[PDB]
Design a protein around this ligand. Structure first.
Ligand code: HEM
Ligand code: HEM
Ligand SMILES: *[C@@H]1O[C@H](CO)[C@@H](O[C@@H]2O[C@H](CO)[C@@H](O)[C@H](O)[C@H]2NC(C)=O)[C@H](O)[C@H]1NC(C)=O
Ligand SMILES: *[C@@H]1O[C@H](CO)[C@@H](O[C@@H]2O[C@H](CO)[C@@H](O)[C@H](O)[C@H]2NC(C)=O)[C@H](O)[C@H]1NC(C)=O
Ligand SMILES: COc1ccc2c(c1)c1c(n2Cc2ccc(Cl)cc2)C(C)=NCC1
Ligand SMILES: COc1ccc2c(c1)c1c(n2Cc2ccc(Cl)cc2)C(C)=NCC1
Ligand SMILES: CCCCCCCCO[C@@H]1O[C@H](CO)[C@@H](O)[C@H](O)[C@H]1O
Ligand SMILES: *[C@@H]1O[C@H](CO)[C@@H](O)[C@H](O)[C@H]1NC(C)=O
Ligand SMILES: *[C@@H]1O[C@H](CO)[C@@H](O)[C@H](O)[C@H]1NC(C)=O
Ligand SMILES: *[C@@H]1O[C@H](CO)[C@@H](O)[C@H](O)[C@H]1NC(C)=O
Ligand SMILES: *[C@@H]1O[C@H](CO)[C@@H](O)[C@H](O)[C@H]1NC(C)=O
Lengths: 552, 552
C-alpha cells in the first residue's frame, strides 16, 4: 500500500509518498539525481571510479608486514593514517539520529525519546505486502529451520584469529553497558540512556544506584575481602537490585553496576577487575590531591576509567579483531581539525550484529576443570574457588569460536539466536542487501557468493528463494569470512562506523574535555594514554599474570 | 581554602588545586601559556593585534546603511557575511557542556544529568572566603538595597529601538519553552529536558501531556470555537494540568502546552496563534499528502513549526533588537562546511540575563482600555473580550520599555527582580568582570564606566566598594546601553552565543534533517523558509492585521 515499500530511492536518498500510489525521492547531498537517485554527478563519477573496495582496503592493511612496521615507528605517518581511518569510517553514521522502530520518517518524538534504539535504516512499513518490502514470499522462512540448518554448531569451530575467552568476556562486559534492552517495552527500546560508553555497568545507570555502590570515602567504591582478595560487595550490604536465581546464597549475591553481571563468572571477573582499578585510581588521585574530597575523587576516577576503556578498546580489542599490521591509536586530537559530532545514539542494528554467541565454547575450561553451561552460569563460587589469577590464566589459554563461516552457535544458547532472528523481524528490519547498500557495499548476487561455499548456500536458497530477501543477522553468522578471519565483510563494514561513533563520540574526546586538568593533572592523563589490557590485569590481579586477547 | 578561589587562570585556562594551598593552570588550546595562562603565543599576538572590539563591529553593522543595502541584495556576499556571524559567535560556548550549579570540575554527573542548567562559568567553591572568591566583604550588599536604588522604575523609560508588546510577549512566550526552572529542586534545575526549541510550550513536555492536547484527527491539536473564533481547549474536557487561581471559571481555563501560559493574556495570545498555525499546516500537509495518517501529519507539522520558529526568531526577532542594517538570514547550509556541534544545553546564565522585565509597561493598553497588572494577570476573559485581532493591533502600538540604562524594573514585579539577585548568589555566580573576561570583553574599571553616568554609579560604589565584586544580573539592567539601543555590550556579547547555539544547534539544522522530505516535501519546506511574524499573524488572525516588533 505504501508506495515506498519497494525501497526505490538509492544512494541514501529518502522516500516520501506523494499520493496513494506515487512517491518522490529526495536526493539532497547524495551525489546523484534522477527519479530514484541513480544518475551520478561528474564529481561523483570520479569518486566512484577512484574509491577502492573495502576488501582491497582490508588486504593492504593485513599484508606488507614490513611496510607497516616502518609506518608504525613514525608518529607522523601513523597519525595521518589513523586520522584517515577515523574520518572515512565515521562519515557513514547519521548524527543526530533519525529513525527508530516506530518512525520510518523523521520526527521530534524519534529524536528526543532516548528510550528507543536508533536505526541505521528505517523499518519496513506496516502496510507493505512482504516482510522485506515487495520481494519474497508473504512470510520469511521458519526461524527455527534457519537456526538448525546454518546456525547451530555441529563440531566446535575455533576462531583462526586466536581470540580467547578473555576477549569474549571483555566483549560481553564492554558491550553490555550500552546494550541493555528494555524488555518491558520491546526489542527496540534500551535502558542505557547514556547511549554510549559511560561505564554505567560499573557505577550504575541512576544516581541512587551509584550512591548505594559508593563508599563515600576517598571516592572509592564499596568492596569486601574474601580470602584476602577484593571482591564486589553483597546485595545485603548495598541494597542494590541484582538479578539472581532464588537458590543463590546471600554472600554470593554480588552487587555491581549492571544488574545482570551475576549471570556468568566471566562478567564478574571483569567487574572485579574494573572495581579494583577504580579504587586504585582513587589512591593515585588522593596521593596527588590530598585537598580533594570524596565526590571529586570518585568523579575524576570515573572519567579516567572511561578514557582507559576507550584506550583499551581501540588499541587492544579493536586492534586484535582487525588483524591489521597498522597499530591503531586512541588520539582525540586527530579529530579536532575535522567535522565530527561529539554525540552518539546506540543503533538497534549495532545491537543485532554484536550477538557474537559463536565465540562461546562447548565448555568453560578453568585451570584443570571443564564446566558445562549448567555448571558455569550463575555460579560465582567458581570465581571464589580459583581466583582472578587462575581465571585470567585459564581464559587467556582457551580459544574462542569463530563468529562468521556459519554453523557455530553453541546449542546451549540457541534460543537467543532464534530470538535474534525473530526480534529482527519484529522490528521490521530491511534485508541484508539493503543494509549492504546503505553502507556502500556491493549487494550479493547469490547465496554462494555470500557463504563462499555450496552446502549452506543450498539450504539458504531453499529457504529464502531470493538473495534480496536474506535477513541481516543470519547472514552475518554464515557469511564467508575474510581469509583466516573471524568476521565477513558485512560485519566489519557495518559495525566499524557504529563502534567508532560510540567511542570517539564520547564527550571526553571533545577538545574542551581532552586536557590533563580534566583528569586531575598529567598523572591521571598518563593513566589513560598508557592504558592496556595487560596493564589493567597486572595492576589489579595478583601475580601480574600475562594476558592478551589472543592465544599463544 | 581552595587555592583557585581567586580565579587565577586567565583566557579560559582551567584551574586545578595541586595541594592545600597550591594551584596549576591548564592552558591547553588557549593560545596562551605561563603560570596563569597570560603569556601569548605568536599566533595569539597576531590575532590580538587584528581582532576588532565588539563595539567596533556593532558600529559597522549599525552604520553604513547604503553599503548594507547593496550587500543585502548580493546573495553570495550576504551568505558570506552571515557565515562569519555564525562562526565567530559559535566559538564561545562549551559544547558538549561542562559545569553546572554543583560541579566546578568536569564530571560525568555534570554532563549526563539533564535536569541541571549548565554553566558558562563554574560556581564559586563553598569554602572561598568571600561570595565572589577572594574579593569584597564576607556578604554581598542588601539585594533589597540594590533592587530599590538602581532597578525599581520611578518613571517609565520607553525603549528607543521602539520594541512593542508584540515583541515583549513573543520574547516571553518563545523563551519560556527552554526556561522552566524546577523550583522543587532548585534554581539550577530545569524542567525543559529538550534544552532548546522543541515547542513543548505548544505540544507539551511529556508524551502523556501531548496526547491530552492532541485531537488524533489529521494531526491537529484540540481546540474550541468560542464566538466563531478558534481558542485552545478547556481543562474541563481535556484534564491537562494548568496553573490557575482557584476562582477562575472552568471555561476560562485554556489548556495549552506550557502550564503557566494562563498567567497573562499576552502568552495566551501567542499560544492561540501558534495553535491555529499547527492545524493550518496540518490542513496544508493533508492537502498535499492525502495518504498520510494522524501521527505523521502531527509530527511533520511540529517539525515545520519548529522551523518557522527558528526562522522568525532570527530574521524578525533577533533582526529587531540587533539594530543591524545587514539583513540576518536563517540558512543551515552555511554551517555544513564548518565545525559546529549540533547539540545544545541551556545555560543558567542565559536564563539569568533573559529576565527582560523592564520591557513591561505600567499598564496594558488594549483598544481603549488600560488594564493594570492586577486586572491583566490570570484574566483570559480579556482575550475573549477583545479578540486576537484587537490584541495584535493594540500590542503592535503599545511600546515596551528599555531593558538596560537602569531603573526600569516595574514595581509590580519587584519580587521577581530581587529573586533573580538572590538566586544568582544562591547559585554562586561569579562576578560581572569574570563573565566579561569569559566572553572576551574588557573588564570594567569603574562603576561609572559600567553605568555611563554618575548617580546610579555612586550608589553602586557605596554598595559594592569594588567593581570586581559587581554582580552580573544587576549590571545587565543598569549597564550603559549602546547608542539609542535597548541593551548594553554585556547583554549582547554574552547572550548572542547562547542564543545562536540554541537556534542553529537544533537537529533540524543538521545536514540529514535540512531537506524537503523531512517536512513533507517542497510545500512544507517553503512554509519554513518564507515564515515571518507578519505571515504568522496574517494567516491565523482574522482580518490580517498589520503587526511588527517595532512601533510605527
Ligand atoms: C558467556 C555466556 C553468555 C550467555 C549465557 C549469553 C546469553 C545471552 C542472553 C540470555 C541474552 C539475552 C536474550 C534476550 O533477552 O533476548 C544475550 C544477549 C546478548 N548477548 Fe550474550 N551470552 C553470553 C555471552 C556473550 C558474549 C561473549 C557476547 C559478545 C559480544 C554476547 C553478546 C550479546 C549481546 C550484545 C546481547 C544483546 C544485549 C541486549 O540486547 O541487552 N553475549 N546473551
Ligand atoms: C507579562 C507579565 C509578566 C509577569 C507577570 C512576569 C512574572 C514573572 C514570574 C512570576 C516569574 C517567576 C520567577 C520565579 O519562578 O522565580 C518570572 C520569571 C521569568 N521572566 Fe517573567 N513576567 C512577565 C513577563 C516577562 C517577559 C516579557 C519576559 C521577557 C523576556 C520575561 C522573562 C522571564 C524569564 C526568562 C523568567 C525566568 C523563568 C524561569 O527561569 O523559569 N517575563 N517572571
Ligand atoms: C540529577 O541530580 C539531582 C541532584 O543531585 C538529582 O536529584 C536528587 O535525587 C535524590 C534521589 O536520588 C533526592 O534525594 C534529592 O533530593 C534530589 N535533589 C534535587 C536537588 O532534586 C537527580 O535525581 C539527578 N538526575 C538523574 C537523572 O540522575
Ligand atoms: C518514548 O516512547 C514510548 C513509546 O512510544 C513511551 O512509552 C509509552 O508511554 C505512554 C505514556 O506516556 C504509555 O501510555 C505507553 O503504554 C508507553 N508505551 C510503551 C511501548 O512503552 C515513552 O513514554 C516515551 N518516552 C518519553 C520520555 O517520552
Ligand atoms: C576506527 O574505527 C573503527 C572502530 C572499530 C573497528 C574498526 C574501525 C574496524 C573494526 N572495528 C571493531 C568492530 C567492528 C565491528 C563491530 Cl560489530 C564491532 C567492533 C574491525 C573488527 N576490523 C577492522 C576495522
Ligand atoms: C546568530 O547569532 C546570534 C543569535 C542571537 C543574537 C545575536 C547573534 C545578536 C543578538 N541576538 C539576540 C539575543 C542576544 C542576547 C540575548 Cl540574552 C537574547 C537574544 C543581539 C541582541 N544583537 C546583535 C547580535
Ligand atoms: C547441531 C545441529 C542440530 C540440528 C541438525 C538437524 C537439522 C538438519 O540440518 C541438516 O544438517 C546436516 C548436517 O549438518 C546438513 O548437512 C544439512 O545441510 C542440513 O539440512
Ligand atoms: C527506478 O527508476 C526507474 C526509472 O529510471 C523506474 O523504472 C523504477 O521503477 C524505479 N525503481 C523502483 C523500485 O520503482
Ligand atoms: C558451582 O561450581 C563449583 C565449583 O567451584 C561446583 O562444585 C558446583 O557443583 C557448581 N554448582 C552448580 C550448581 O553447578
Ligand atoms: C599569576 O601570575 C603572577 C606572575 O605571573 C603571580 O605573581 C600571581 O601570584 C599569579 N596569580 C594571581 C592570582 O595573580
Ligand atoms: C478581568 O477582565 C475583565 C474584562 O474582560 C474585567 O471586567 C474584570 O474586572 C477583570 N477581573 C479582575 C479580577 O481584574
Amino acid at each position: 500500500a505504501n508506495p515506498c515499500c519497494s525501497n526505490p530511492c538509492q544512494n541514501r536518498g529518502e522516500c516520501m509518498s506523494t499520493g496513494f500510489d506515487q512517491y518522490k525521492c529526495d536526493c539532497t547531498r547524495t551525489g546523484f539525481y534522477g527519479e530514484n537517485c541513480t544518475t551520478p554527478e561528474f564529481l561523483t563519477r570520479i569518486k566512484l571510479l577512484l574509491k577502492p573496495t573495502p576488501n582491497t582496503v582490508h588486504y593492504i592493511l593485513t599484508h606488507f608486514k614490513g611496510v607497516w612496521n616502518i609506518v608504525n615507528n613514525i608518529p607522523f605517518l601513523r597519525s595521518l593514517i589513523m586520522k584517515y581511518v577515523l574520518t572515512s569510517r565515521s562519515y557513514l553514521i547519521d548524527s543526530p539520529p533519525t529513525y527508530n522502530v516506530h518512525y520510518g520518517y523523521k520526527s521530534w518524538e524519534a529524536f528526543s525519546n532516548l528510550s528507543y534504539y536508533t536505526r541505521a535504516l528505517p523499518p519496513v512499513a506496516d502496510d507493505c505486502p512482504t516482510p522485506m518490502g515487495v520481494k519474497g514470499n508473504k512470510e520469511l522462512p521458519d526461524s527455527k529451520e534457519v537456526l538448525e540448518k546454518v546456525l547451530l554448531r555441529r563440531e566446535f569451530i575455533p576462531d583462526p584469529q586466536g581470540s580467547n575467552m578473555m576477549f569474549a568476556f571483555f566483549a560481553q562486559h564492554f558491550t553490555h553497558q550500552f546494550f541493555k534492552t528494555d524488555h518491558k517495552r520491546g526489542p527496540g527500546f534500551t535502558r542505557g540512556l547514556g547511549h554510549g560508553v559511560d561505564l554505567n555497568h560499573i557505577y550504575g545507570e541512576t544516581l541512587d544506584r551509584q550512591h548505594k555502590l559508593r563508599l563515600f570515602k576517598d571516592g572509592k567504591l564499596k568492596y569486601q575481602v574474601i580470602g584476602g582478595e577484593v571482591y564486589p560487595p553483597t546485595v545485603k550490604d548495598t541494597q542494590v537490585e541484582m538479578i539472581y536465581p532464588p537458590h543463590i546464597p546471600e554472600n554470593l549475591q554480588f552487587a555491581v553496576g549492571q544488574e545482570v553481571f551475576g549471570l556468568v563468572p566471566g562478567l564478574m571477573m571483569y567487574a572485579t577487575i574494573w572495581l579494583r582499578e577504580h579504587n586504585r585510581v582513587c589512591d593515585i588521585l588522593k596521593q596527588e590531591h590530598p585537598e580533594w574530597g570524596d565526590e571529586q575523587l570518585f568523579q575524576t576516577s570515573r572519567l579516567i576509567l572511561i578514557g582507559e576503556t576507550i584506550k583499551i578498546v581501540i588499541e587492544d580489542y579493536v586492534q586484535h579483531l582487525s588483524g591489521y599490521h597498522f597499530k591503531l591509536k586512541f588520539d582525540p586530537e586527530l579529530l579536532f581539525n575535522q567535522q565530527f559530532q561529539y554525540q552518539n545514539r546506540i543503533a538497534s542494528e549495532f545491537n543485532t550484529l554484536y550477538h557474537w554467541h559463536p565465540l562461546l565454547p562447548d565448555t568453560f575450561n578453568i585451570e584443570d576443570q571443564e564446566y558445562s553451561f549448567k555448571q558455569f552460569l550463575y555460579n560465582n563460587s567458581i570465581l571464589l574457588e580459583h581466583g582472578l589469577t587462575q581465571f585470567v590464566e585459564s581464559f587467556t589459554r582457551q580459544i574462542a569460536g569463530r563468529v562468521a563461516g556459519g554453523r557455530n552457535v553453541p546449542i546451549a544458547v540457541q534460543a537467543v539466536a532464534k530470538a535474534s532472528i525473530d526480534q529482527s523481524r519484529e522490528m521490521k528490519y530491511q534485508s541484508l542487501n539493503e543494509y549492504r547498500k546503505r553502507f556502500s557495499l556491493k549487494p550479493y548476487t547469490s547465496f554462494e557468493e555470500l557463504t563462499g561455499e555450496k552446502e549452506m548456500a543450498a539450504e539458504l536458497k531453499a529457504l529464502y528463494s531470493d538473495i534480496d530477501v536474506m535477513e541481516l543477522y543470519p547472514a552475518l553468522l554464515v557469511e564467508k569470512p575474510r581469509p583466516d578471519a573471524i568476521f565477513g565483510e558485512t560485519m566489519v563494514e557495518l559495525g566499524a562506523p557504529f563502534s567508532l561513533k560510540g567511542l570517539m563520540g564520547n564527550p571526553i574526546c571533545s577538545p574542551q574535555y581532552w586536557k590533563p586538568s580534566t583528569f586531575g593533572g598529567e598523572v591521571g592523563f598518563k593513566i589513560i594514554n598508557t592504558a592496556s589490557i595487560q596493564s589493567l590485569i597486572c595492576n589489579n590481579v595478583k601475580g601480574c599474570p600475562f594476558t592478551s586477547f589472543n592465544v599463544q
